[PDB]
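Why predict the complex rather than its parts? Because the way molecules touch one another can change local conformation, and only a joint prediction can capture that. The input here totals 1822 residues.
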Amino acid sequence: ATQALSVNPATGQTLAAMPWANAQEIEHALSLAASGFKKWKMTSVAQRAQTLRDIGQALRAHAEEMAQCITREMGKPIKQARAEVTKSAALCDWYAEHGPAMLNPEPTLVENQQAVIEYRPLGVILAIMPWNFPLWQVLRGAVPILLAGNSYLLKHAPNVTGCAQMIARILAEAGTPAGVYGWVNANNEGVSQMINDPRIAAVTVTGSVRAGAAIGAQAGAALKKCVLELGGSDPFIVLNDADLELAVKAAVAGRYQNTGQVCAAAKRFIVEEGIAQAFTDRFVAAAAALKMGDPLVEENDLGPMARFDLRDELHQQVQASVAEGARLLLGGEKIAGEGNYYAATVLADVTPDMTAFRQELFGPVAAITVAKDAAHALALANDSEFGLSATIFTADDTLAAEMAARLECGGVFINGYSASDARVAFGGVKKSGFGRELSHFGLHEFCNVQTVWKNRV
Amino acid sequence: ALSVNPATGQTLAAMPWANAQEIEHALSLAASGFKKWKMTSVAQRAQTLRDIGQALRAHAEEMAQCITREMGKPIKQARAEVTKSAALCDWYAEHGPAMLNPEPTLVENQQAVIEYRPLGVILAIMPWNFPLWQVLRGAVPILLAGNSYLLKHAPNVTGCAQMIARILAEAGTPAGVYGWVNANNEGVSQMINDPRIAAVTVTGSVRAGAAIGAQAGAALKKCVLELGGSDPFIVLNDADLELAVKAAVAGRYQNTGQVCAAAKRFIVEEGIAQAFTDRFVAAAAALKMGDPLVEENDLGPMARFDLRDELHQQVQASVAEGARLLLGGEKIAGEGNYYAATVLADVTPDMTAFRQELFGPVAAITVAKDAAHALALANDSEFGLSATIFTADDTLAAEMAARLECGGVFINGYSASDARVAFGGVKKSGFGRELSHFGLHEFCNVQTVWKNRV
Amino acid sequence: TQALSVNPATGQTLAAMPWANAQEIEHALSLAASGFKKWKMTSVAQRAQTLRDIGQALRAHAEEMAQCITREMGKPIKQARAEVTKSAALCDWYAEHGPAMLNPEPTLVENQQAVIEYRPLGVILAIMPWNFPLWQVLRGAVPILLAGNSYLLKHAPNVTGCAQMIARILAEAGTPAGVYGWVNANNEGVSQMINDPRIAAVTVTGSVRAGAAIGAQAGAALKKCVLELGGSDPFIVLNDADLELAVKAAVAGRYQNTGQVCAAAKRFIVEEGIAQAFTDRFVAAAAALKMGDPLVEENDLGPMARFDLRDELHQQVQASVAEGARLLLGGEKIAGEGNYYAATVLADVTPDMTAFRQELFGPVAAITVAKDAAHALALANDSEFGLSATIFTADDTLAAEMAARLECGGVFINGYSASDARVAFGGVKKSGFGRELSHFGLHEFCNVQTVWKNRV
Amino acid sequence: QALSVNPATGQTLAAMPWANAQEIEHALSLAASGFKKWKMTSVAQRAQTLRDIGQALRAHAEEMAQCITREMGKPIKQARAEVTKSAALCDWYAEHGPAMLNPEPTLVENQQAVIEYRPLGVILAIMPWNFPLWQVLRGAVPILLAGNSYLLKHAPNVTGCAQMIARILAEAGTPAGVYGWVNANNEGVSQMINDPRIAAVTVTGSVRAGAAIGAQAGAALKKCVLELGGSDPFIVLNDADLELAVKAAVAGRYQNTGQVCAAAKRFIVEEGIAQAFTDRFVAAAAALKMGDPLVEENDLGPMARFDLRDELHQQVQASVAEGARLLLGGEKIAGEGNYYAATVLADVTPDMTAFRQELFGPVAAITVAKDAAHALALANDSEFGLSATIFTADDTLAAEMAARLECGGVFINGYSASDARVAFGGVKKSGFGRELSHFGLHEFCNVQTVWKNRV
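Output of the joint prediction:
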């Protein structure tokens, strides 16, 4: 239970407070979503694709205002908030172009073309979204959910209600029908009420493991399907034969993007003994050179963290790790001042029993662990209760492919930079959740896959 | 866990619940079995499927007899269940491997692919109505994907469960790859919460699905829930009446009514209502009921005594609410568990026969004023598994199919599950899909592999 | 469960009642809250007079009430009349003895500066079973009302005729609107009410499954509950027992209400020396009990209340015999339209068997032989339940020693177990928690409030 | 995880791994074997053990108070007072407790039926960090006297205190398993609640923890006592002794740097005296000394948890955004420690964060009441109901209002506190069940009717 309050993390100053939605408001959101769905499900998929293009255009028309809102409410460097808007608008256009074909009926092996599989919409999808990508997280799911013919009803993180209001205004400007996209500032009880309401067909959650478990349990009890995209503690494996400098550049970007607040950030660096010291020296130097400060200044790489309590939790994780024997090579301190800044941090000599190896470090703290050889590296990578994405750097192409097949995660990047992309599946295993987003997966997760069979006699 | 022959009322066997050591052994074996099985080739696994089909065929009569003995199904139907289950093994052996091929993506120059990786041990909770087919409908694709399968079967069919395990071991299914455990609800909970269980699959009642779904969700594990249905069977004025009646009777009465996707709610347009009703009642009255070892019998006893009590109460309530009893609606005297073939007419949407799943030989008939009213009636349900529509108008049938809130729509034919098409529903009928490539992919770790992203 | 009344003697439908809708649930809650708002301000004297008026109104409708109980759930008519008599007497007992229980308590704080006050809590939601449709309701409602609370009842779906009649009786007695009320809520309606701030606390009498489901909801809502659940009461007979009295008490204890009593004597644990003698006398007495139409006063046993429960009971008997129990009498459903099960005795019952580990809620006795008094105690305590217990022995000191070591909430020494307004009722382990009757049932639903002046 | 950090300095004290499966099993096994023996002891023997615990705690009094202050920031003067109160509780129950376990006569004729208070079994306890010793002993003392075992899961930021309490109770000769503790994580707590060796559960803590645990206990058919947060109203009417009301108000709000479930949190003051009360209260609060809690004269320490200071500041920020007037404080103190300024919010109306949520730190909320009827309505307009205070010269009115206040304790013209001699606990979201006096002793008894010769 958090507070419905926006505070600028760079200044510590209050932005706005918003009361939780009352009973009439929750009922109005549900009623409007259902009536919106009733009409939207009857449109042509090509009309829905056009609506996606219109949303993309409205977003681009308000791009700077949107980016400024993201930075103001949650501290993301403005260069990255702008890139978030660019990516989110590109996603609308990508699904408008490629999505409709993914909804074509499928032929079957039943003789004489008598049976097909149709992809029908389910209904209203309740979405519970976090603050780390206030726009991208929303559209990553909403774009294919809408294209499939569903309505989308959003509960956004209570620290980004300004962003949520703005998203709603932009989507309405684009001509999105009333109720097809909407949002409500529900508290926990309000979310439970909605999950249990027959107007909600299914639920999608992006956030913490605890949030995912709480909601997944309620959805299961109500016989409603979920997609849960939860935290990660992604391993980033570097073998002796890697292109060392490229590995370091990808490692630094992977860990420190969005001030480390990324579910699929590179969090556990597992480096083969031969190259470990060279990697560590270079990684530390690059991390120490990262600029941190006012996120309104385009050249700062690191902003403040979004939430004061979350900075306190991360500091405790660093404290615990040092107490357990980790070596602090850089940072490990809250920065004095009224903002919510935490120093770029590196912990080395991290072993599997330590906090920095076992928990998700959701901020600018890298953990470095030395592996005996590639087999040890793989074992260390899989020794985690999370399983979102992973990276492997090695010149041995055959070995990398073999390791990919044995990594217990939903995405593996070989000799490159991990990211989410419309063209490929996103999502993990174990406590990172289940279900997939993007490509045709995100589109079909919220379809009623319907067999239609004529003259079965 | 007691087995009682429903045809005679006599005890067959009692099997104690698995203890803590037995639960631990089942999980340990499943996990070690998976560790080896996940490393096998798809060709080796497809060969195992063929070996399973062969072993089933070699013990086909013994299997059928066991099914009938424990849960009452007419023997001809038990034999058909074995036949369909063995064919499923061969269908997946042939068509399954290609479903596991890596997928190209739109990323340029073949730099990214999607792979379908094994997930781990899948825990299955299965019911007694198709003790073999419900198990294999899921287990065949689950095993082909490289997972292990660990089954908790219905307590009244443990004899069937033992026999299934016996046959799969004979076929050479590695230890732990297929296994089963006679766990009580506490044991099921313990396994769902164990890290060695990767995901869960449930076929059963809404209450069971909700309880298990809640536990799986809390443990961050995905489910597929294939729960009850109250399938609408719509007959419009221009229907082929003789085929509609045949399909209606087969739809409602197969397996003595105990089918999740049975035709349960007959929604008939005014014009044809009386003619349909008269023919339906006559056909239902002509069905023969008795000893399920006697091949002339179309209907056996119901599987469970308490479920017959419950069904009878649903009939009594429907009658008290105003439904017209046209046939049956009585328990049959004797020590067996027989319930008369039953027809309720003048059923309105507020009634028990319309709102609840009637899991036994009881048809509900409701008159629709027009096609729009028929559609509204069909969709006025908390369930959404499958539906049937009979009309001579191809265009109208397709238009209505697009508006039916269920996972399967059969136009002018007999509904059924088939390996070639998706099976599963919406609303309280659950979520997720079985069969075709759907049942294979539900329990895969869909993994993006992208090289050189710079 | 279906919202349907069926006469278990005849198998025929009595009535069907639809579940309460949203408006009806809201009305029940609103009425209970407005009722409590006025009732909490009344004097204890005024409330005690209402209890007397309820007693009078019950007596005025005694035969109609008894007939309704028998009709809906099958209880022999003499036993239904006794349930009405006991319920009316409870009203008078609390009217006389209850008020003093609500007096403020002095404390050891010096100079009378602090007292403890027993204030009403609010609306108490009650979920009650079909086995004593009147007594289980009033057992709780009487003290709950006297304390200044409202009582809102969800009754078992097979006894809604009884529920309706109780409501008309309490209205005739002049019980204010909302102070006593009931609603035919389904499971989703009960959950809704538990989670509504107008419900202050919950009381449940019934099955372990129901108690666990409701207890979880009440805990989650931060609301206190009293759970009075099933039992598998041991009835211990030692070599030196007054055998005549033990057999009479054993038969009455097991077979009252056709065995459908939470605190029934269910597990007979008999010392090796007297086992055969007890068994012979008990089997002969059980065989002599008359079964049939419960409107016929001479019948000792009626049909069981629910068809599904007779089937479950038969399966428990079937499993017990499969496990090795010796069937000494009965063990069969009676042919016909009614829901009759023969009076049954299972012997050679060992701790691993169904008859020993599960609650047998019907006319089935289980007899287990104990090597000595120590083994008897161990067997008695080898159960997931712990409601009440009986010990028959002439050894005064040993009986008291055993009572102290029995894991149950009630122990009867050389007598017949029963609930009584003068003593606590309730158990431990899976039998639940909390206590009904005497001052316990009254204080369970009070806000115990310290009031302390001039603490400086 | 379990990490101790000194809130005055921000520096790490110790980390402690969570109990593993073998450790949890050992804790439950030892508690059960301990109970099996302890339930057979005489009450006189158990009473002597209580006296011995009091003696051992007084022998290590300064070490214990120092540990309390070091781990959670309480001013040392108050940590010492906590030790004094806890040891006094041991002696109080040793003296007055045994008689509470005497069998009760009943109205059944000829003395044939009595009520006995039997031990129930192992009681699982989940305790918070605000009174690391007192919260434990408040329940453990009567639970042990009743013949039960006590198995503790303490707050993860005070495991040093937990280890020290266990050493002291072992030095006193408390049998193995009769008192014990385990550093269990949430999964371990769930495991224990569902284990048959645990008979019942007691929780003192947050509303969220109470609800999570109460749900698990209810599902397991186990009784709870839940002593959760409060937002206690403190009503001051026009005819009050103003200076005494102000002193009691300041003490009630600011004790333990405001981290008390039964703190005075919502000041509801009649319009006639509102401004005078406000001026005096603000002056006294501003004069409180805040700083190093090792300095015997400081009145306020740092708050115990960094995340909780952040949450509290957000509650202040939201209240001000909603229209509350900041009269004092409302800022985190710069530095490495966890200090928050003594704060006063005025013009607080019932729709505001400061009125509707528990403010667990040094933040007073002042609301003006039109008259005594309005004051009572404001007091009762809360989801909480732990205790309350009323200041007025009208004794009859005070008594009338007490009867209508929806809380478990009412203090008239005085200072609220817990005390062994009276019941403690509340209603609504403050939980249910009562501690102390005979209430805390009987909550975890098997109340057993023993009836001879019933016909």
